């Protein structure tokens, strides 16, 4: 049950002025996608303040890639959900390495130990994480946050736009083209390249698609196939077959080094490391 | 749950190029607002059909308004939710004035037996359906479908433009501007002017909307005030302090005789009767 709205003063919508002449802002299933100028942060703060709304964060940090991790919480501290509950469950082989991040009001952390980036899919699986967040957000750890990344974001599924692809036409997505393996999509199918550094949803949806493609994967390696972009190629085969509540921009998932930064993107928010 | 939707060829989305230029498509809180060249019918009509939806309708027709049903019955039969099944409740004072109307496959009718316009919020909120049907529409029975009104309005919460408003600044929107009324919304407030005779949702929501607004009624009556636009003004502010998750355009809501047909409405679908 939600409680009313206070009363707020906001700009009106205009209705005869799009938000984006530039982009698509919702897909055909009439999942907004999720672009700067399109949403206003003070409604959206609100709903999700008033749920008492706590958001899972997901990372893996093993072997040398715990090195990224200092500059990726500090980062998240400054721009992931500000204002809001946030648990970090940071998965690592090393423990002892994790630095030591201050971390604001209402935002915890918690270390659990543990083919790496296709293994995630099974381990999210395992620790759906239903007892202690609304939902889960499942990321790269070789990353950092640069601007805003808030509750804009929360639905019940949601992909990213790979950034290598979102101009692209179908035939041009790097999909699992081998009719032999589970991730299969053929060459007239396909509505969008989801990056698989940057998923989501509700714990129950989240569970269900990394159940999905950790089962997939098992199916591959019974078979003796291996998908040619791993985690990633079984999640473009889940989202294909299950259209995402949301779909965010490119703005969520950069590389300014290789990419530069376009006319169309306003922020660029949650990037690759330098 | 929802299993997976099989394989299906479509045109692939064009994330750098608008799907409409001239209109605001998604509102400020993410819900999406539906125009013609939005939506793939086809991709929606797989998901709701994978989910068995049925879709009830509920109009009154009290007194002379009777007349009014043959027409919208057999005008519903050619274009309300074609293909789902639906369960038609029409509430009366005249059950033997309730036109014969051959229903298609899947679509029952039910006659309940029954200041008009403003009473349906008690009437519907007391059948709250929650047994029979996944949504609920609530419609004015003096309208007609002449075109394609399916799934794309299916959501938790919705509500209609106004034809008079949706060009309109919020200034000139005709909400109840007297703070002795529960309807009150301030000149400052307000994102559309949503329309009385077309609004829904899944079953708790539409009850708690109509509950809602009963209260409200209830307690202006009380206080010696009837709201400038009754149930409809009632209406604006609950969809005002709980954001609908979509909203139709006005091609679900018109009038031709005093609007003609404007070049941003691609389709006219429901239609006051000349
Ligand atoms: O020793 C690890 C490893 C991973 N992780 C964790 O796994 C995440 C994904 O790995 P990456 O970020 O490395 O992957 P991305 O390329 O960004 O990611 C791409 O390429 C991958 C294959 O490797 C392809 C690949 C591997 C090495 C170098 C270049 C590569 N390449 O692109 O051609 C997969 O296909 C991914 O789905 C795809 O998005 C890290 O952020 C850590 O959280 C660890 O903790 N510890
Ligand atoms: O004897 C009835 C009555 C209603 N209904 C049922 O109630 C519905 C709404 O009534 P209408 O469709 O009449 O209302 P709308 O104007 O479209 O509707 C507007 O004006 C209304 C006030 O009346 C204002 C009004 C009343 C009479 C004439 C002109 C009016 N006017 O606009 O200035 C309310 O303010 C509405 O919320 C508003 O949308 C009908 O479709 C029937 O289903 C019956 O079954 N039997
Ligand atoms: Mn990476
Ligand atoms: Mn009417």
Redesign the interface.
Known sequence: ??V??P????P???????????????????????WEG???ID??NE?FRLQNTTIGLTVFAIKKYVAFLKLFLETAEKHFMVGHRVHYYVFTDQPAAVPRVTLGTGRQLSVLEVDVSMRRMEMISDFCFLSEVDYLVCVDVDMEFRDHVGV?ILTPLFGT?HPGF??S??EAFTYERRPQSQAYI?K?????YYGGAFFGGSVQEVQ?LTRACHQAMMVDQANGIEAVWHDESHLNKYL????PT?VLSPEYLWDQQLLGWPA?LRKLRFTAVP
Chains 1, 2 share one sequence.
């Open positions: 049950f939600m009313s709205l009363r707020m003063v906001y009106q919508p205009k209705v005869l002025t799009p938000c984006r002449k530039d982009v698509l802002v919702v897909t055909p299933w009439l999942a907004p996608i999720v399109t949403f206003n409604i959206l709903q804009e736009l979102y101009g036409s179908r053929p007239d199918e396909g509505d969008f269900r294909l077959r299950h259209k949301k169309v």
